[PDB]
Design a protein around this ligand. Structure first.
Ligand code: 8DW
Ligand code: 8DW
Lengths: 264, 267
């Protein structure tokens, strides 16, 4: 924890990144290494808890923590900077000849690797979506990891009373009972697969949010996107099983995508 | 897992190979067979891409492509184990050889072997994308094999578009690749032409003294490297054919290999 502490003065703050969609997150420069970094600034105990979790996280496809300023306010969380920004904008703007089917498989394989790691370490993500995935050089993809929750005892994590979720990415049991688990992360992953497959289209386009839960209850599911391989869509549908115990594990998901990626 | 998986303990590592120019590649011993092998390991290339390269190598079977022997992919550190080519890379080999031994007939033999490998990749819908003397390896009696880590699956005749910001070895790179990041078996043919030039000059650097930033401009105006000293006109014609501006005007590797086999046999 102390090894993570840095002086705030080591960093030159720049502009807020991502058009402000992530709140107080700024592009910054670590002067010593001339290294571009991402800096989130400051809710205190939650903030410190999240920094503490990020200290324990070590995976090639999870955003890597570089430093922390938790001695005095303003508080800082310093992480690596992903040059190509968030996956949603990236998909929307890319050359699809370059970012073709094999690359889409590659992205899914990387993300599922990160989630398999979290699954094993008894963490849950709770905000898996393309907007929260980042892209680096050579189609490298990493998942943003501020907000991970640790499962202290059971498989299920209960969100704070009155918490609001992104409805279109949120599993039915999470919508209904504010219960989250690695299986609700698997549901969100299914939606993320749909985002990838459509090069960043909005899920359930044109559908009333008030109807989403009931539609899901009565077995409505997004149709296979144009050009999406049938095996990928099968995985998508598996992720969207109504009963969480019927959804595949991230280990299974990652194995399947790894196989498809390697055969491509 | 499959027949390819082996225990890490089957292998004893020695020193890093090739002066480190190929990264984390080591000479090693497969203890069971007292066999010297080459081992590529992963310290920190993305993992999934590494594993995919191993997967592709499992499918490769040709006398002039480096043969995969085994793989360690259960747990880190990951290994790709292949046969070891005693004389190292073709570039240094050509530079350091006794040219009375590595004479004209041997140069033809080398081109024939390499073109055989590329004809095989062409048939099997793979592209190499980094053909050059530095990526060919030499064994006893002038045996040559093409290094095949990095192969990509691509239906022969289709185009692969490289990632934005990718940096290429400019002097080996086809004009459509330089300009538009487009690669195909035909860009491999272009690079093969440059490799032929490397062979004919015994490992000279191509486009000597020419500013890299101008190479593309020159190629546009139909500048091409001159015939190397001692290079037979037929071989130079093949070279020039490999460097046609339009990829579809370049010969196939089947055609190239047939031409070299004929020349080697007529020697
Ligand atoms: C979703 O990305 C993040 C969300 C929260 C966050 O706070 S944390 O430090 O406590 F984790 C950090 C990030 C984040 C870590 N590294 C990052 N690298 C790049 C970006 C980013 C996302 N979207 C757009 C931009 C951008 O404006 N450019 C690339 C120009 C940049 C965003 C991040
Ligand atoms: C281009 O050579 C390789 C590159 C990558 C690689 O990884 S892997 O996934 O395909 F295994 C393996 C090789 C490789 C396979 N067999 C080989 N045999 C010899 C050499 C080599 C190249 N250059 C110099 C040396 C050397 O230092 N000596 C022979 C002393 C040895 C290099 C190799």
């Amino acid at each position: 924890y102390d090894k993570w502490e840095m002086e705030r003065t080591d960093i030159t703050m720049k502009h807020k990144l991502g058009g402000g969609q992530y709140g107080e997150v700024y592009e910054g420069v670590w002067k010593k290494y001339s290294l571009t970094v991402a800096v989130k600034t400051l809710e205190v105990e939650e903030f410190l808890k999240e920094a503490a979790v990020m200290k324990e996280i070590k995976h090639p496809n999870l955003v890597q923590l570089l430093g922390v300023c938790t001695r005095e306010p303003p508080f800082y969380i310093i992480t690596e900077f992903m040059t190509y920004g968030n996956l949603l904008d990236y998909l929307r703007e890319c050359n699809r000849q370059e970012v073709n089917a094999v690359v889409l498989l590659y992205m899914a394989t990387q993300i599922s690797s990160a989630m398999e790691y979290l699954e094993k370490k008894n963490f849950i993500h709770r905000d898996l979506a393309a907007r929260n995935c980042l892209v680096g050089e050579n189609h490298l993809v990493k998942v943003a990891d501020f907000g991970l929750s640790r499962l202290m005892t059971g498989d299920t994590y209960t969100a704070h009373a009155g918490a609001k979720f992104p409805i279109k990415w949120t599993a039915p049991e999470s919508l209904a009972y504010n219960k989250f688990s690695i299986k609700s992360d698997v549901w969100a992953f299914g939606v993320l697969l749909w985002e990838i497959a459509t090069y960043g289209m909005s899920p359930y386009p044109g559908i009333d949010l008030s109807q989403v839960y009931e539609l899901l209850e009565k077995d409505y599911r997004m149709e296979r996107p144009e050009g999406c391989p049938e095996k990928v869509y099968e995985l998508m549908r598996a992720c969207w099983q109504w009963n969480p115990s019927d959804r595949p594990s991230f280990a299974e998901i990652h194995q399947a995508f790894e196989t498809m990626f390697q055969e491509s």
